Each structure stands twice: as structure tokens, then as C-alpha cells.
Design a protein around this ligand. Structure first.
Ligand SMILES: Nc1ncnc2c1ncn2[C@@H]1O[C@H](COP(=O)(O)OP(=O)(O)O)[C@@H](O)[C@H]1O
Ligand SMILES: [Mg+2]
Lengths: 524, 524, 524, 88
């Protein structure tokens, strides 16, 4: 592997060229009145979308190094969506702005480490301004209000989201299911959600979601890392005759067993998926058991002397639904007996009695919440299947926004909040002159999302930015209606958390690029 | 896969070039005296046709992006035909006209978003003028009149179309079968049509039609998604022994079973086709049953406890004919007994009495119509197979025109209707100056189909258009006879619905391209 | 699948260039003294022939578009031969003549649509003149006279042809068989000929003929489309054991069974062929049965409940000979008992009494003729096999000429008739000036076959044409003898039908090219 | 500019006739004969221009419809007379 290596400006300029291509294409779709982009499939007609996230995913550059820059931004921007649910397009816009002006500063002979430090300082100061700016969203009115707005003026969608949170609680678990009929159903049923992803991207049966949905699947509980194919066979065949999907929970699965299942699921005999068990060490023992009680399943432990081959359907637990995304696994309506599950809760509540550690009482309390809290599930009813799934997508988008809105409140969505904060900290300075430059770059970059939106609309960015600066608080310009006033009242807003994370991620990658003196890649 | 990205003028110019190639070729065949096009097949001699749709299917460009523009137009133009039945070429002609003048306008420095908005207003305004212009077709005389015209001046074809509608109804189900003999037969037999397409395009045994015809096939009714090949094997083998085709209805079929059935059907031992069940969720449960009663078959449900493997011929319903197109499935002359079918209808009629809600009452009423209304069929008789088969194609073409004529009436078909409407709203203005320009582009573009018709004929486009402008209503020039008068009375007309659909689709794609800043494709 | 597309002159010029090479090479062999062409074989030495058909068949061009022009002419020219038996070369000559001037006319700026119309009018008028010019062939002396002249001045060939027609009838079925002995045998035996060709070109065991000859084959009669390999297996081996060819008559055969049979016959275990059954719908029910009675076989009907697997040799009819060409199938000397066949005729004669409709009477009558009339056959005898096979080819060529001569009479064959007709209607004019030009183009083109004949000979085309123009009726120049007089009396003539068919086909393709504005082909 | 246009139309149509298998020299004679007759027609059609406004109108039309030009020119010709010399 012969390496091509670039240093300083040759390296950084190449990244700049790469990032600009990615950002220039994606940014046009940011505003309510965005400009559509055309992507092309290998066999068939071209594809047009105003979705920045779809455009960004597809982008790759021939020139190594330039490609690297785009990928670096895509990685961080994708993360903002992962931790916020929106702002992926906004993060990229901000990243471009911070990077371009800051990058020029290093090329001008100014010190890069200080510029990063200055930018970070501006970012840290900026985040507090958003927090002061931020309007809380804790009550029923705000929960429904943000949910309906996100849902594109659909009051009913917001109403169920509020009801769900109201019932299970803000931190509770809410899931979305296809509607059995026209009426919308909100129900609380035994179930559990935990942090853990799928072992392979190949397992996914729902490409747009990036998640795996299974119908009334059997559930396998295991106490060891799976190092071999052979253990699965007697149970694997048994589920195959049943004609239903199989779900596996264990410490880890090795490639010899994992790879065959991946190949087996993809154009194969039985389509199954497996995930890692929640917790570690001593905790997984209790954690796995809670799931067993919930699904009415049997736990299999190597330590006990029980092996996977020695297992049957009776050992396996069941649930009506299970959905697995990139890092989260959740189950709906386990078949475990109510007496068993309620009884299990009593045992855990009793356990909480020692209160030996803040950690142990907290940890036990969390287990209670996962097992006894239950899972709130919403069915979406509609006149037609197309409307039903489409509405369902809208509900899920609103739900992510509602959770982000709840956690940190909300800010004006027209990119107004960045504008408002940028004008607010004109005063902040750094010890080194180079640091001051980093600060200006960061604040100047903040303005860009507003201008981009206005630019997309075909309106003058400078005129609108100037007027917005004049006004204060949540006051701003609504690009969609061509009006000025309180953006939140209008319905144009973004969760505080998403604006914060987009901005922070943009700064993290920008500083990271600024301090890079070398790039290594394979030759063309 | 490194991406080549085009944006701004570079992106738009390539789309323009791509659309012009597609439109220039296809437009020549639009007129009654349209010029022919030569397509060269990879095997044997070249093929000459005056059919624009055939030419459109063949058009692909070497230059990526430019190719995309053509494909984008083809997709939308095909859709107009799909929702209408004719005017695929007309839509393409209009698309070219709107795109070229509007695209020049964006290049000039005008705002694209406003131009789209202006065009949309003009398009929307044009549709009401078209509605007023339109001559209604509700009477037997009108039904026959449009039917015979479409059928290339064959009165007998028109007479049957009117008779069919007169029995089952305007919204009823009409099907065409090869004639058993010389005499034309119109019959009403038990049968059902529903809006569900075929999972695999490979299933089609009739390449010109794009539909699947089966003779006295067995019918499988299932209540689950099919993910495994093996369930099908005992029933599958049983039908093969029979020596005749098998039809499958269920939630959906996965690639594991679908791919093998597709391969099994093409150059394989048993050739069968499958479609999705009508309705959704709770609703499908009753509808699948309706089909079962109609064909004398047995419904199979997972919930009940019966599996596909545990099934036999006695469990399968039968019909003399079934035909499946790209998005519709219909069955003819099911073997279900009259006592069962009529009784089933009574059960549904009884259900209607509850009247809890309009949605459920109506929904039940729709079920009654499908199950009890019956399916009218047409057999076409001739002394020679060539005449018989050719006549059948003509009947079907006339039928689509008659349905479109019925639903929205008819308009002069010489391109005259676009001319008449364009002249009528010469005072329409937008807000922004750019919006006004979009309006002029849209109305000006309307003229092109007339001019194209006359141009193909080798006659003066401007002089004929000038005289046509002078006249009022349905007055215009008949390209076929080189005469002026009422176009509808001359036997030249298009359904109101096809003219509208062509115009609307052309505007949708044109505006869509105008608003697109960036295009993405793979490198050469 | 990128496409290269040409419009107007760029498209038309390529067709012109393509047609000219096809026509320039083929035209040299048209005269009795025609020049020879050298075709190179992939294996072995080069081949020289004066046969225009072999030359034309072989020609293909590198330049896409130019190739299309040649192929377009070849298809059309081949069709003239298909519907006339001769004039394949003459059609191409006429096509070149009309195409070259017509293309210049469009190039000159005159309207193509009108030019086509003018040419067609000239064609229609010229055909009418040809009909008046033509000397009818009705009586035995004319029948024998044309047969002997076609047969290269052999009286015996002519004598048998006249006798055959005089026996079974002008419209009856006459076949040619290898002579069992030295003497010529003309016999009338039970047999049937119907319109229907072979399903696969691969089946042909006689490549010069393009027909399939089978000796005393077993005959399978079936009433369903055959889509499966399996039904033939029990019957197929039984014929293999026999060591004789098998013939199949049914609705159709699908690629599943057809493709395997094609491979099986070609370089495989059993060599057999299958054709489509005559008639359609209930008509075929009667048509298949007549054949069964004729061969002593048993018809197998799905509706009866009988299956191909359930069939044996006893259910198969037999005939001493069967020959299948591109669209004609005939059987000779079927086994079927005379009492059965003759009795079957009695049932049909009885059926005629119903007289429900003119169509039914005629259709029943046709069945009588096919069965009761019998098939007249000719055994060609000679001392040596080389003389015998050669003589047989000559008989077949004479037979086609005799059928054409019978249907429309005969005309001078030196291309004199085109000369005579072209001079006769110098009067004809069109409403549009462009049409008048088209008329001259068509008339002028007519002269070329005469000139080509003289040109090939080595004599002045203009001097001979000039003298011929001066004369009247069938008077003209005989290229073979270099003399002037009545061409028909001199032994040189063409059937009226071949002259007409060549001329009309040339006109059809020429006009078709003239109105073409676009050509599509794959890149080099 | 007007003369050039006539050459354009005559030539294109004339060549087209030549293409149509016609002797060009005869076509030239036809053209020349038609032209001679056309010239005679113009002499009969011509209306005398003697008043100042008519002179102004030709000046205005010649000067790409500039009214001021026609106005100023008419004044000059009237003043200097028939044989007067006017320059710019
Ligand atoms: N407003 C007008 N309307 C109609 N014809 C006009 C108008 N103005 C000028 N013309 C005519 O067109 C001709 C060409 O104008 P011009 O540019 O002066 O060409 P020349 O340079 O005269 O070929 C004039 O001689 C006149 O007959
Ligand atoms: Mg001038």
C-alpha cells in the first residue's frame, strides 16, 4: 500500500475543496422553500428531493483527500441528527462557514491551535445564550404545540405525542405501530427498551428507517459470547418450521456464527437478527432475567450447564413486536405472565431496600422503570395504507423533535437563534489576537443558516439578516410566509438541543480540520 | 463510486439538452399525419413506428445528467398516460415548451421559485377554462360517439362500449377477451376487480399489453406475508400436476419466495403469478373472504391455525379468467356458487343497517358493488385471427378514452383546446415581475401541440394557429382533413382528463427542473 | 443503452448510402446475362453466384443507420418474393430508383408527405395499366406455356404443372416429392394443407428450401397450449424407439417446452417438429378433427379430460410425407381409412344444409375441399440424382410463377412492362406541385429494371429503352437474344403479380423512408 | 439591406428550381423577363413627392423612424432648393 501524503496547505486546501462541494449541494435544500437536488439511481429514472439528509448520504468525491473532507463533515453532521433528530443540513452549513474563514486564517500565517481555542470559547459562550433564549417545553400545551408544528400543522399528531408522554412520562418509551383500523390507538403494554444496536446492517428489512421490524418473533436469551454456528442449529431449524422470525440476546457474536447468519438472512433460508445484551458483568445477569420474565422466556447460562443446542421453543420467549435501529433495541407486548412480571417487580422493589450505593439504588430503580414502566405504543389510523404509513413517518419525526424540545426547550427555527446569539456576544475576546480571529469566525459563521434559508427562497439574505439583527429575542423573519414577528408564535422553531448540537458538532470538526498538518491516502 | 456534481447553469443546460433530444424525436409522430421514426433492434431488421410511446421507451442518453433530463420527462409523461390513457406525446411536447422558455428566464437573472409559482397559477387557471370548454359525455349517444372515434371510425366497437356501461355502470368493470367465435358477445358474470398490482414484472406473459392473463387458474387466498418458499411446495406441486396456472393473494411476498417464484416462472417448470390482497388491516379480512366466496375457495389464516403447507386444491377458488396489469388485478367468472355469493351479499347488506359512520357504511357499499354488481365482459368476434386480435387492441384503447371522456367530458383534440384556453386568459398577472414571465411561458407553451400537429403535416403552424385563435369554443383546424369547423363534430377530440393531465404533468416536471440547483451522477 | 439519434438529412442520407450499396451489389445479377458477385465463406473458398436473393441475404453494413436502410429494403424486397415468388431483385432495383430521387426532392425543400402521396397515386395508376397490359393465364395452354418458360424451356415440367391444376384445381394443393423411379408420377392422394408455419427456424432440415421434410412421421393432435416438457416424455420416447420423425399440432408451444425441443432436435437425441393448429376458437375444434380422420389419429382435448401423458402411438395419426415451410404446413398420403375420411365428408356435406349464414356455408365448404379434394403430388423422376434434385428445384420455381400467372396473368419480363406503363401515364398530375414531382419520380424509377437488364448485358440501356418506348403493347427487347418483338412470345415474361408486388413494395418502403425524421441506434 | 433580402429569396428558390432538373439559363431568362415587367409596374405606382412633409416622412423612415431627422432634412431641401448641396 503506497501512500500519498499531503502537508499543511496542500492537505487543508484539498479538504476545503471537498467540504465545499458537499456543503454547496446540501445547503440549497435547508429552507422551508428550499431548492431541490437531483440524484441518480444506477437502473431507472433520476431522483429529486428537498431532503438534505438524503443528498448528503449519497455524496462521494473521486479525489482522495477532498473526499476525506466531505466524509469528515458527513460523519459529524450525521451524528448531530443521531443525538438531536434534525439539523444535519444546518450543521453542514455551519461547518462550511466556520471552516472556510478559519482555514483562511491559518493560511494567513496565524496560529491554528489558538484559532481552535478561540472558536471553542465562542461556541461555549454561544451555547449559554441559546439556553437563555430558549423557551421551555414541559407542559401539555408546549408538547402538543411543538408536535403539531413538526407534524406540518396536524393537531391530532401532536395531541397523541403529548398523551403518550403524559401517560408513561417524558423519559418513558413510546413506539409507533401500523394501525389496525381508522381510529388512532394509544395503549400501554408490557415491554422494554434498552441501549444496544444490531450486529449487522444486513439484518435490516426496512431500508429508509435503517431499522429491523419483526412480527411476533421468538426471543432467545443467552449468557455467553457466541463463537460458533453449531449451537444455533437445533433451535434455528425449530423456528424455521414455526415460520416466524427469531431474536437473539447474548454477550457478543463472533464472525463465524455472525457472518453465516448475515448471509443466511440475506437471500437465505431463515431471516433472523441478533443484538448484544444490556449492561455488563454482574448487572447483565439481572438485566437478562428481567427480559426473560417479561417475555416468558427461559435464560440459558453456560455457568448453569445449559447449552444452546440443548434448547427448544419452550425455552424461547415471545413478544408481538420488536424494532432494532443502529444503536437501540426495543420490544413490544411481551407474552410473559402478568403475575410473573408483577411478581418480578416486587422482588426488585424489595432489592432496592439495601440502598448500599447511590449507584446500586439508582441502577435498580432504572431496572424497575424498564420492566414495570411498560411501553407506550401508538397505532396510526388512516383511510388508506399510503396515508397510514406516511402519517406514521410524520409522527416519528414529530416525536424526535418533541423529545429534543422537552430536554432543552425550543428556539426560533428560521436560523434566527444563531443570528440573535451572534449579535449578543460582540464583546468576547481572547488572550491571543489569533484567538480573537477565531471568535469572529465562529460568530460570523452563525449567520449563514439564516442567509442560506433566505437565499433558497430567492429573497435578499443581507436585507433580512440586517432587519433580524435590529429586532430582539424570538423576533425574526419567517421565510415561508415572508413575515416578521415572533418565530415561535408563527410555528417556526427548532429544538434548543438540535441547534446546540449542530453548532457544537460543526465547531468540533472545524477545529479538528484546522489543527490537521497531514493527510494519508492510497494513490489513484 | 465517486460522484460528478453539476449545478446552476451547468446542471440545467445538460437537462435542457437531454429533454430536447427526447422531445424532438417523440413529437414528430403526434399528428394524424405524424412523421415516422426508425428504431434499430439489436437482432434482425430495424423497426419503424408512428407511435410516440414506443419511441419514448427506447430513448436513453450516453451523457449522464443530460440523460437524467430525458428520463425525468419520460417518467412524468408515462404517468400522464397511466392516469389518463393518451397524450403521452402531448405531455412531452408541452414539457419541452414550458422548460425551454422558463429555463431561459432563470438564466436571464430571474428568480426560479417565482417562475414556478407563476406557471402553476397559469396551469391552475387553464384547467377551469378547459372545464368550461369541455363538452359532457354522459348519454349513450356521447359514449358511443367517443368510443367509435377512438376506435378509428368503427361504429360497432363504439356500440358495445356504450352497451357495457349501460349494464354494469360507468364506474363498473369492463374486460375484453378473445372471441370464441365470429359473433361479438357482451355478458355479465360473477367476478371482482380490485386495485392491486403484480409483485414481479417478470410474471407478464403478454409483452405488448404489460399484463398477465391466466386461463381457468386456481386461486390461493392467504392471510400472511410470505417469506418462505417451502410453505408453497405441497400446493405448488399439486397445481403443476393439474397442468394449469395458479394465482396468489396475500399481505405480500418476500424476496426469498418471490425471487424463486420469479425464476421458477421464467424458463421454469411451473409458471404462476401473485398479487397483494385488497384493502388493509381489519378491512382486508372481510374483503379476502368476499373473493373466497366468489371463487368458492377457502381462506387461510395464521390466526386460525392453518398453514399454506396444510392446504389442498379443495381450499383453492377458481375462475375462468384473471388479468393483472401494472397496478390492477381483476377476475372473471369465478366458480363460487350463486347461493353462497348472493347470500354473502345479503350478509353485507344487513351489515350496512348499523350506519355507525359514513366511512364504514360507504366502505360496506363498495364491497357490495364489487361482489354483487358483477363484471361485464366483452368477446370480440372475427373471421380471421389477425382482425380479431387487432380489433381487441382498438376496443381497449377506445375504452380508456371513453372512461376519460365520461369522467371529465371531452375537448377538441387537434391541440385546439390548449390554443383556446391560452387565448382566453391573456390578462392573467402574477405578483413579482418574474411571476408574470412564468405565466407567459406557460400559456405560450400551450400553443406548441397544435403547431406540432400542423408541422408534422407540412402545413403552416402560425397561419393555422392564427385562424384557430380567431374562432371560438371548439372551432379549429382538422389536420387530417385540412378543414376548419367544430373539431368535436369532425371526430377529432381528446378527453378533457387527458388534456388536463398532460398539461399538469408537464408543468410539474418543468417547474421542478427550474427549481433544481444541483445534479449528481457517476463518472464516465 | 446509450442511443445515437439522427434527424432529417443526416438520418436520410445514411439510409441513402446504406440502400445504395445493397442495391448496387444486387442489381448486377438481375439480367439473364447478369453479372456475378463473390461472397466469401467463413470456412473454405469464396462463392460466386448470379442469384440476387443470396447476395441480398448476405449483406450487412458497419455503419449503423446506413445498415438500417439496407435492412429496411431487404425486409420489403423479401416480402415481395414471399407473396410473389420472384422479383426480389427487381423490387430492390425499383426501390433504389424511387428512393434516390424522392430523397433529393425532400432535400430540395419540397414536402415529404405530399411526395409520398404523389408516388402512391402513380403506383395505383401504374398497377391499373399493368392489369390492362397483362395477358391472362386461364386455359391449359397458357398454364403449360408459363410453366415451360419458367422451367428454362422444358416442356415436361410445364406439362405436369398444367395437369396438376387441371386435376385438383387452381387453388388446390400441389406438392413435389423426390422421384421413387425414373418416370414422372402425378397422383392424387388423401392429405391436407393449411396456413400455419413452424414455431422454430432451427427445425429446418433442408436449408436451401427453408422447409422441413419428414418421412412417414407419427402425428400428434392436441387441444391446448403446451408450456411443459413433461407431457411429451412418455410419447416422445415411444417415437424414439420407432426411429421415425414426430409431428405436433396444438394451440401453441411456450419457450419452456419449445426451447428444449429446439435444442433436442438440433444435435440431440430425437429430431421432431411442431406447428400451430389451423383456425381459432370453436373453428379449430372442427379443423383438428378433420386432420384426425385423415391420418387415423386421435384428438386429445383437455376439456374431455384426456392428457398428453395419457396418450400412446395408437392415438397418433400417420402420413407418408409432411413438409413445413416459413408459414405453410402440409401433409401427404395420410393413413386414415377411406371409409372414415369419405364418411367424415358425408357428415360435413350434411352440415352445409343448415345454411345459417353465408360465412358458415363457405367455411364448411372450405373444410370439404381440404379433406375431400385431396392433395395432388408430383414425383420427379430422372436417371441420376443430380439431375433429379436439380429438376425438382426447377419445378418448384415454375409452380410459383404459374400460381402468380394464374391469379393475375402475365406481362413482358424484360422490365418492358414498367417501361410500357411509365410511358402510358405521363398525363397524371397531383393537386400539390410537390405531388407532381413525386409522380415523375415514381414513373422514372419504373424505367430502371429495363436499363439494368441491358446494362448487365453490356449493351446501351438508353438506346434500347428509346426503341422500346416507341413500340406498343408487349413489344420490346429480349436481352437474351438481343432482338425486338413480342416479349411474351419470345419466352421472356414475368407474372403480372410479381411485377405489381415488386413495384408496390418498393413504393411502400420508399415513401416510408421519405416521411422518416428520426433514426435510433447503439453507439459503435 | 432590402436588396440583399431579395437576393436571398431569389437565389434559394432559383437553386431549388435548378435542383428540380431544369435548365438554369432558361430560369435566368424567366427571372429577367419578370424583373423587367416588375420595374415597369413600379413606375406607374410611384406617387410624386413634392411637399415638405412627404420629404420629411421619407427622411424619418430612412433614418430608422427618427422623426427629428425627417423634420430637419425637409427644412434644408426647401431652403437650398432643387440643386442645392446638403452635407452632414
Ligand atoms: N415602421 C415601419 N413599418 C413598416 N415598414 C417600415 C417601418 N419602418 C421602415 N419600414 C420599411 O422597411 C424598409 C427597411 O428599412 P431600412 O433599415 O432603412 O433598410 P434599407 O436600409 O432601407 O434596406 C424601409 O425602406 C421601409 O419601407
Ligand atoms: Mg435606412
Amino acid at each position: 500500500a503506497a501512500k500519498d501524503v499531503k502537508f499543511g496547505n496542500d492537505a487543508r486546501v484539498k479538504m476545503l475543496r471537498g467540504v465545499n462541494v458537499l456543503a454547496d449541494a446540501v445547503k440549497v435544500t435547508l429552507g422551508p422553500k428550499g431548492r431541490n437536488v437531483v440524484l441518480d439511481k444506477s437502473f431507472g429514472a433520476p431522483t429529486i428531493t428537498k431532503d438534505g439528509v438524503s443528498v448528503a448520504r449519497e455524496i462521494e468525491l473521486e479525489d482522495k483527500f477532498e473526499n476525506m473532507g466531505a466524509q469528515m463533515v458527513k460523519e459529524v453532521a450525521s451524528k448531530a441528527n443521531d443525538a438531536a433528530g434534525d439539523g444535519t443540513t444546518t450543521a453542514t452549513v455551519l461547518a462550511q462557514a466556520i471552516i472556510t474563514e478559519g482555514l483562511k486564517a491559518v493560511a494567513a500565517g496565524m496560529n491554528p491551535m489558538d484559532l481552535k481555542r478561540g472558536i471553542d470559547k465562542a461556541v461555549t459562550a454561544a451555547v449559554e445564550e441559546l439556553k437563555a433564549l430558549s423557551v421551555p417545553c414541559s407542559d401539555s400545551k408546549a408538547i402538543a404545540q411543538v408536535g403539531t408544528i413538526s407534524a406540518n400543522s396536524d393537531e391530532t399528531v401532536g395531541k397523541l405525542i403529548a398523551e403518550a408522554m403524559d401517560k408513561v412520562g417524558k423519559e418513558g418509551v413510546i413506539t409507533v405501530e401500523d394501525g389496525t383500523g381508522l381510529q388512532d390507538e394509544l395503549d400501554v403494554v408490557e415491554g422494554m427498551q434498552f441501549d444496544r444496536g444490531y450486529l449487522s446492517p444486513y439484518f435490516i428489512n426496512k431500508p429508509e428507517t435503517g431499522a429491523v421490524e419483526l412480527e411476533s418473533p421468538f426471543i432467545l436469551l443467552a449468557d455467553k459470547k457466541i463463537s460458533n454456528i453449531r449451537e444455533m442449529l437445533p433451535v434455528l431449524e425449530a423456528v424455521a418450521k414455526a415460520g416466524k422470525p427469531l431474536l437473539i440476546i447474548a454477550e457478543d457474536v463472533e464472525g463465524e456464527a455472525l457472518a453465516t447468519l448475515v448471509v443466511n438472512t440475506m437471500r437465505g433460508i431463515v431471516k433472523v437478527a441478533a443484538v448484544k445484551a444490556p449492561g455488563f458483568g454482574d448487572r447483565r445477569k439481572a438485566m437478562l432475567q428481567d427480559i426473560a420474565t417479561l417475555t416468558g422466556g427461559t435464560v440459558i447460562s453456560e455457568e448453569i450447564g445449559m447449552e444452546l443446542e440443548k434448547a427448544t421453543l419452550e425455552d424461547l420467549g415471545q413478544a408481538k413486536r420488536v424494532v432494532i435501529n443502529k444503536d437501540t433495541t426495543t420490544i413490544i407486548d411481551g407474552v410473559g405472565e402478568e403475575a410473573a412480571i408483577q411478581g418480578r417487580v416486587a422482588q426488585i422493589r424489595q432489592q432496592i431496600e439495601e440502598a448500599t450505593s447511590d449507584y446500586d439504588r439508582e441502577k435498580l430503580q432504572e431496572r424497575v422503570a424498564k420492566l414495570a414502566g411498560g411501553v407506550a405504543v401508538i397505532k396510526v389510523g388512516a383511510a388508506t395504507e399510503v396515508e397510514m404509513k406516511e402519517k406514521k413517518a410524520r409522527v416519528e419525526d414529530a416525536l424526535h423533535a418533541t423529545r429534543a424540545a422537552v430536554e432543552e426547550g425550543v428556539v426560533a427555527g428560521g436560523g434566527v437563534a444563531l443570528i440573535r446569539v451572534a449579535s449578543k456576544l460582540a464583546d468576547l475576546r481572547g488572550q491571543n489576537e489569533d484567538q480573537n480571529v477565531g471568535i469572529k469566525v465562529a460568530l460570523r459563521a452563525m449567520e449563514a443558516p439564516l442567509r442560506q434559508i433566505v437565499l433558497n427562497c430567492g429573497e435578499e439574505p443581507s436585507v433580512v439578516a440586517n432587519t433580524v439583527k435590529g429586532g430582539d429575542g424570538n423576533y425574526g423573519y419567517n421565510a415561508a410566509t415572508e413575515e416578521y414577528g415572533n418565530m415561535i408564535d408563527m410555528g417556526i422553531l427548532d429544538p434548543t438541543k438540535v441547534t446546540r448540537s449542530a453548532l457544537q458538532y460543526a465547531a468540533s470538526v472545524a477545529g479538528l480540520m484546522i489543527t490537521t498538518e497531514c493527510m494519508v491516502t492510497d494513490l489513484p
